Amino acid sequence: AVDTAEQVYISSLALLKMLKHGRAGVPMEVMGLMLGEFVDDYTVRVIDVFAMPQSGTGVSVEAVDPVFQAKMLDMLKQTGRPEMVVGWYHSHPGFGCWLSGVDINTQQSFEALSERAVAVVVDPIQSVKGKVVIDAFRLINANMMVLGHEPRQTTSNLGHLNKPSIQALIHGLNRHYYSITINYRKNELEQKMLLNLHKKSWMEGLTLQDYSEHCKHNESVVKEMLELAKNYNKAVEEEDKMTPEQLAIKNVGKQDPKRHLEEHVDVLMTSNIVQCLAAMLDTVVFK
Amino acid sequence: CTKIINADSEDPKYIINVKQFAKFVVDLSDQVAPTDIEEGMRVGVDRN
């Protein structure tokens, strides 16, 4: 048999756990185990993650003592999470996401012990604003590459997005290991505890703040729109019998109408309409 | 490769200076005898 273009399903909770723990020990590397199920011949599902005692340093990690790990499975098992481990993960503080030569020597033991165990790598300080740098890998054996045989099998959903990074391509990409596609199967119920939740209100829908804080805002915006308008008038009086191509020719900035004139109008309309409507509702809902 | 300046005796902690880096407290490796390590001579050092 041989592998194909398969997949990894990670629960939302395990993602939050990995991000949080990785960011906690920021000046040093961190590592942990992960638990799940090989649900079929080619997907793998990871449900939960827990850390372990470790002797961190700015470029490497080792786990301290085994008894902790052996115990915690037996604890969790009697409150309804019996799954064994499926793999492990660690973090790279500032570098790219890729495997070191010692990670190979670690990984070979898992692969020798269980056939499919993925390895996961996370970057906590490139994942800064609105994206996550997380990835999953597995080894390729040396001798097979020398033989004509290639690593895997092909069906058409291999090629989306999965352009490898040049930084990763400098190390043993392909030559020593291959990437696996990842996706987040957020099932129902936990969907709503986020969407309908992190932002909300109730009585806030009916608040007025009708003092000067409003009138002063109006008398700032209209005041500056006076000058915007005078500018636009001057900026159109040219009326030269030229061609709008020449207008684009010299066009560089501060295109009055679109650049500024209109956003002030939209802001002023929004504020005043909403305020008047809210006052008109409260005048009837209460006595 | 670096040098050693003050060998603690009967106390396995050694002190080293890179002459370009700072001074670290360090020790010996597994295979090397602790006898023929006279203080004040050039030694090879692991990067990690």
Binding site: V59, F95, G101, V102, I104, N105, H171 | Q20, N48
Partner: peptide, 26 residues
Amino acid sequence: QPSGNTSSSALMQGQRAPQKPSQNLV
């Protein structure tokens, strides 16, 4: 004897930084 003299300059040595080792030993 007034002074309108000048001088040379030595360099700034501190430039090195550590890098991640990438040894491959099984």
